[PDB]
Amino acid sequence: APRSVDWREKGYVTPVKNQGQCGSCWAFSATGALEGQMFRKTGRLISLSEQNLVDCSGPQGNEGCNGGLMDYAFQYVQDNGGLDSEESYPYEATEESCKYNPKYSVANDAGFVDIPKQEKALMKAVATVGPISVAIDAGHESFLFYKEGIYFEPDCSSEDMDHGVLVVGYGFESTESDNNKYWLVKNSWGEEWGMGGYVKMAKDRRNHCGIASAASYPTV
Ligand SMILES: *[C@@H](O)[C@H](Cc1c[nH]c2ccccc12)NC(=O)[C@@H](NS(=O)(=O)c1cccc2ccccc12)[C@@H](C)CC
């Protein structure tokens, strides 16, 4: 595979969003991956509605601000026959009744693909598909305060993931410890967190924080 990938340079990625005080990370991860695959198909990048997913994908297993999964969101888009744009169905950071309107649907999918639980497989997917939805263990103060560099948390779990994010690429940079590889990850905590809303997470370090343990993307 390539040694470095960044889908932002190819037009696949919307600006960083902010989920607010609502456990809807799974919906931001899902819209990020679908934004990328829709752009791959149509050449048009359109921001998609996380609120549509929060309010409407309960029947697929999601629980609004109380948690969810990207695959359940991809299934909703397929079952429902569409997903509204961000502009038409804006984000409110609280669960409400479903207000989906098919007239304003701008995305579709025909299912999804789950990636094997190996960083080598995640790398192949990122290199060939586009941005990939992943789940990570983000439950450490070091993640809240991250500013720059490669994030490595010795107490991170590869089995207890609690936060959905989007891998938009990978790369390397020289470091003190010579652990130089990273996943380029888009978060949904606004642009004031991290590096403009992004984090470089340790790559090829025993599946650090579980980044390869629940990776998937929608089929468009
Ligand atoms: C991210 O904003 C969100 C925060 C959140 C809300 N509730 C919980 C409970 C445990 C951990 C994290 C939580 N995280 C998630 O949605 C996660 N999904 S989950 O599989 O841990 C999950 C937790 C609670 C309820 C439900 C309901 C349906 C499906 C899943 C869950 C992460 C892993 C998303 C990638």
Q: Which two tokens stand for residue 140?
A: 């450490």
25-42 vs 70-80: helix crossing angle, rounded to 10: 50
CA pair distance 127, 133, nearest whole angstrom: 14
CA pair distance 112, 125, nearest whole angstrom: 13
DSSP assignment string, 33-74: HHHHHHHHHHS----B-HHHHHHH-GGGT--TTB---HHHHH
CA pair distance 31, 49, nearest whole angstrom: 7
Distances (CA, A) of 167 to 53, 66, 105, 182, 198: 20, 23, 25, 10, 10
Buried b (16+ CB within 10 A) or exposed e, 127-153: bebbbbbbbbbbbbeebeebeeebbbb
Instruction: Label residue 192 exposed, middle or buried (CB < 10 Å: 0-12, 13-18, 19+).
Output: exposed
Query: Active site includes 208?
Result: no
Q: According to the entry, how was the structure determined?
A: X-ray
- Which residue from 215, 196, 133, 203 is spatially nearest to 168, judged by alpha carbons? 133
Alpha helices per DSSP H over the chain: 25-42, 50-56, 70-80, 119-128, 141-144
> Which amino acid, one-letter code, is at 219?
T
- Sort strands 150-151 and 163-172 into parallel, antiparallel or unpaired: unpaired
Kindly report the CATH class assigned to 5-219: alpha beta
Give SS3 for 93. Answer: coil
CA 163 to ligand 1 center in whole angstroms: 7
- For the Cβ of 189 lying below 6 angstroms from any atom of ligand 1, the answer is no
Nearest residue by C-alpha to atom 26 in ligand 1: 67
Domain boundaries along the sequence of the chain = 5-219
- For the Cβ of 157 lying below 6 angstroms from any atom of ligand 1, the answer is no
Q: How far is CA 62 from the centre of its chain?
A: 16
CA 196 to ligand 1 center in whole angstroms: 24
CA 26 to ligand 1 center in whole angstroms: 8
Q: What's the distance, Cα to Cα, between the start and end of the chain in Å?
A: 23
